[PDB]
Amino acid sequence: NDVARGIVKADVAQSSYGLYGQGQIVAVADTGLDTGRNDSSMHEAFRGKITALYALGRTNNANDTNGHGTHVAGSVLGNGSTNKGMAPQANLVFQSIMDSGGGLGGLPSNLQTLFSQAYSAGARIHTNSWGAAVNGAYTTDSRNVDDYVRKNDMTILFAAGNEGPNGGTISAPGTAKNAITVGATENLRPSFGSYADNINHVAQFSSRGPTKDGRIKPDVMAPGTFILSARSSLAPDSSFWANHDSKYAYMGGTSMATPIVAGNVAQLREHFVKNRGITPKPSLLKAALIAGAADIGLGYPNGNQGWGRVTLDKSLNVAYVNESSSLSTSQKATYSFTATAGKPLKISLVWSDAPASTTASVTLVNDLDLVITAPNGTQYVGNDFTSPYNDNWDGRNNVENVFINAPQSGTYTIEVQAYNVPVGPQTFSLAIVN
Ligand SMILES: [Ca+2]
Ligand SMILES: [Ca+2]
Ligand SMILES: [Ca+2]
């Protein structure tokens, strides 16, 4: 965590903007949490900050004999003396889903029940380092995530899976359109070797897109190797990649990258609520993370890195649209933005789409298109990264981006076009970085 904090610029958010996640509640569904008791026996990283601790997989036992859930929660918000999480003043809702067999049998058949329970406790961010290796398929769980996000303002994150490096290996429910799906780059701890030596390396095991219907997943990346975080007092050494001390130890996986981003989302949500005066929709938090992310060097579009590695300080200051307009087929929304040469111009359009059928060959339901016109008349369409930039239109993704590395100074015209909206109207969010 301490190194990952610097990589994703959570340090700048903390020290310069004062964003520690205070007043935000993050829910974690994972194996268990240290002793499983909300009392003075609990690990220092979480003692005193647990809103609710629910035992789903084993009756009245939310402890963590595995160590995965304690480590994950630690990276979101641990507030122990060392190795803090990204949002150490956020409060925790923990749903213990591990069963007596070490399986994830505490998950309900309808995931909306899981999310509802956490929502009723106050959580508005829900992070999940679990999934099924279904090679990019959109399953009933994916459908249920998408319906839940469209109806409730809960931001839900899923790990991409650990079945890389082959393409097409994204886990479900990480294949959901309306979730933020997170893959893993490397942490910078090079004395541990090649898995932790270049922050612009995708971790070899991180699952890679596209999804079965051709969408870009994961959405964003964060460090996921040799992450030092909270060690459950009941977990054995074999659960960790390396020891550190009795209270903290190392783990790696897309399970580790996901909670780092969840904590960053709590910092970003805090910023919008306290400093920008709005409650941001899930689509806007997603668009802000994507517009601010860094190309790790592979270029776009790319199923290995998605839209790049989270860079939180860029995401804080975006110009935005927060689901303030909704469109039906053939309508358009038009905005103007004055850009400065000298810094890249990145514009991201994101919408929480209608859930698809699991029998559909194409999961996108409502198709919006992003069209940007530059001061000298050049036009750019969403996700077209080959010149000319206005001949390849996107009909698959519910994220569309226009990234211009060397913009003209002057006013750009931003149009959001409703190409086909059968389940309308459809709202959207926009985030602009310059
Ligand atoms: Ca490496
Ligand atoms: Ca489109
Ligand atoms: Ca093109």
CATH number at residue 374: 2.60.120.380
Query: Within this chain, do residues 227 and 194 fall inside the same structural domain, yes or no?
Result: yes
Domain identity same for 299 and 337: no
Give the position of tokens 């053939």.
Answer: 330
Contact status, residue 95 vs residue 255, Cβ threshold 8 Å: no
The answer to whether residues 380 and 389 touch, using CB atoms and an 8 Å cutoff, is yes
| DSSP helix, strand, coil percent of the chain (3-state; round to 5) | 20, 25, 55
**How many angstroms separate the alpha carbon of residue 200 from the centre of ligand 1?**
8
Q: Are strands 91-96 and 25-30 parallel, antiparallel or unpaired?
A: parallel
Calculate how far, in angstroms, residue 153's C-alpha sits from the geometric centre of ligand 3.
35
> Does 407 sit behind a cis peptide bond, omega within 30 degrees of 0 on the bond before it?
no
Total domains, the chain: 2
Determined by which method? X-ray
Residue 400 labeled ligand binder: yes
Structure tokens at 302: 């790319």
Q: How far is Cα 181 from Cα 3, in angstroms, rounded to an integer?
A: 22
Query: Which of 301, 317, 333 lies at the terminal end of a domain, its last residue?
Result: 317
The verdict on 345 and 307 lying in the same domain is: no
The C-alpha atoms of residue 282 and residue 123 are separated, in whole angstroms, by 13
Q: Are residues 131 and 189 in the same domain?
A: yes
Please list, in sequence order, all residues whose beta carbon lies within 8 angstroms of the beta carbon of residue 210, skipping any fewer than 6 positions away: 136, 167, 168, 216, 217, 303
CA distance 352 to 350: 7
Dihedral-angle region of residue 397 (phi above 0 means left; psi in -120 to 50 means alpha; beta otherwise) = beta
In whole angstroms, give the CA distance from residue 62 to residue 151. Answer: 29
Residues carrying an active site annotation: 30, 68, 255
Same domain flag for 157 and 183: yes
304 plus 326 within the same structural domain: no
Are residues 310 and 339 located together in one domain of the fold? no
Joined together, the tokens standing for residue 309 give 């590695």
Domain span at residue 361? 318-434
Same domain for 332 and 424? yes
315 C-alpha vs ligand 2 centroid, how far in Å? 23
Residues 384 and 428 in one domain: yes
Whole-number Cα distances in Å, 122 to 89, 117, 374 = 15, 9, 43
| Helices within 23-178 (DSSP H only) | 68-77, 111-120, 140-151
Asked if residues 157 and 127 have their Cβ atoms less than 8 Å apart, the reply is yes
Cβ pair 185, 390 in contact under 8 A: no
Ion ligand 2: residue ranges with CB closer than 5 A: 367, 369, 394
Same domain, 262 and 399: no
289 φ/ψ angles, rounded to the nearest 5 degrees? -65, -40
Each residue of 163-199: b (16+ CB within 10 Å) or e?
Answer: bbeeebbbbbbbbbbbbbbbbbbbbbbeebeebbeeb
Distance CA 5, CA 13 (A): 10
Q: Which of 267, 285, 262, 259 is nearest to 21 (CA)?
A: 267
Closest by CA to 373, choosing from 411, 333, 409, 405, is 411
Same structural domain, 281 and 357: no
Nearest to 396 by CA among 427, 418, 365, 425: 365
